[PDB]
Design a protein that fits this description.
Two copies of one chain form a homodimer. With 274 residues, chain A is of the alpha/beta class. Chain A has one domain: 3-Layer(aba) Sandwich (Rossmann fold), CATH 3.40.50. A seven-stranded mixed sheet of chain A has the order 3-2-1-4-5-7-6, with helices on both faces. In chain A, helix 6 packs parallel to helix 8 and helix 6 packs antiparallel against helix 9. Chain A is globular. The termini of chain A are far apart. The complex binds chloride ion (CL). Chloride ion (CL) binds next to helix 2 of chain B. Chains A, B: This is SAM-dependent methyltransferase. Chains A, B: InterPro entries: Methyltranfer_dom (IPR025714), SAM-dependent_MTases_sf (IPR029063). Chains A, B: GO terms for molecular function: methyltransferase activity. Chains A, B: It comes from Lacticaseibacillus paracasei (strain ATCC 334 / BCRC 17002 / CCUG 31169 / CIP 107868 / KCTC 3260 / NRRL B-441).
Chain lengths: 274, 274
Amino acid sequence: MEKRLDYITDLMALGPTANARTIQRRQTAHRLAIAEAWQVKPGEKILEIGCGQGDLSAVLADQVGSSGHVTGIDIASPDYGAPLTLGQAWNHLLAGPLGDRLTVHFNTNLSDDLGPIADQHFDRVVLAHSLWYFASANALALLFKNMAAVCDHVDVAEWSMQPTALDQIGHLQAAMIQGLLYAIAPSDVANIRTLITPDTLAQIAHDNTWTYTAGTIVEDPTLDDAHWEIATTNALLTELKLSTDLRDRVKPLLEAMSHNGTASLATFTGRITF
Amino acid sequence: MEKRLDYITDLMALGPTANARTIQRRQTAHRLAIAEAWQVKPGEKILEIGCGQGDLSAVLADQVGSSGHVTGIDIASPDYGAPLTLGQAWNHLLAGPLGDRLTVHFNTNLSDDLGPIADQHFDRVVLAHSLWYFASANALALLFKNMAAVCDHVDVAEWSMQPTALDQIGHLQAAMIQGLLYAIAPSDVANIRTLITPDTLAQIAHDNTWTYTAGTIVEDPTLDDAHWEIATTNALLTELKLSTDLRDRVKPLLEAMSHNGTASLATFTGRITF
Ligand SMILES: [Cl-]
């Protein structure tokens, strides 16, 4: 309960529901922890891949100070989201106290080509909880290859599939079930697509003659992420176009998951150096 | 009780390794804990589905006394197994102190032909760690329907997919991975085919106006059972006919599994009363 946590939380656009701010404050606290793990300093110019509604971008903008800058990239449209769209969220940030430190490029895929950041350099390119959304591990590796042109390293943070408490097993199960099903038969309806781990990142590094360095683990079990993911997995077995037999077979995994808690996994961090 | 541990262990034919007896005593002890949970009484006639080399059968035969009897069913051949075949194991049991209390039917699947037990009635039918081999949950249900005619209740024991310690997570993942891979690439070599939980059994009971009664959990983390199941899961990437893509998405779930311990899961027990 830092003044600073509350300061940054209060800079965000909120939905109108009862628990909006308490949910937001947890999300914001987790991004401060991640920023602390990465040792983000005042003055830096940072590029964030997978910015979504700006929870991390807002935190980084505060951290880098009035002479720093943070550019968020997302493949999503600004009109995506409810109750607030991603553009409503960003325009709120841009019209606020950190606005001059912030830029956002929506509908943007930087593996295609550097496009809107084409001639810039950054002190840091970062990804937090966007790794699992990549099409494949090779696709993540190609993004990194491109980023080598704009920075000397990429910092990452993503859920760990090594649960540190038993009440995190539900979340591990939701992730595995989504990842396996996507692997079995890909879908455009899919949320989680590739379950990247620190060993995947070490292998990407080895394949490309880079280095991967593990950083500190970030614990944040009170994040609503687990509950959201377990519901997403439940939703997906109905929404996916699965055979009866495959559906029926996934059923016991959903049952088990319902009994394995609702705390959020720990989050691993690390750095790919080119 | 457990007071009969060494007596029963000593009835068992051992393979040639230094720690065969130590491994056997752990297995016999696990079956005694299951028998204790089920509350087997003197004089009972019992039918056991998936008796394997008779680790449970012998325990049961001891407990029912010379007034009871234990019939073991296995789908495998007498010549199955190394360094001890199932028939070596069983012929030894039949020649020993408990042999008059025991009967075995190899190459027997009562889902396919009920002939081998024609006209027989039993006090209970039991299944310990044979639920996951069933072709499907409906196939299990159908067998129970057939057993309703010839006994009062069925007692079950099986791996619980709710870890009680973090070091059991690897065993859980082994089971999950195997169950979804069997959904898409079944093999004869595969032995985890359908995952079955207490919720599965409750639903089966609901569908047929039977009662399911959860019993007590059996903890035995020192069993080698997780170690072997984890090894099987790694190996099935090689043995199963998988697409290159599925392979390379599962390959790193396996590496993830490697960091989540090698202790065995708890065992759930319960009764379907017809
Ligand atoms: Cl053992």
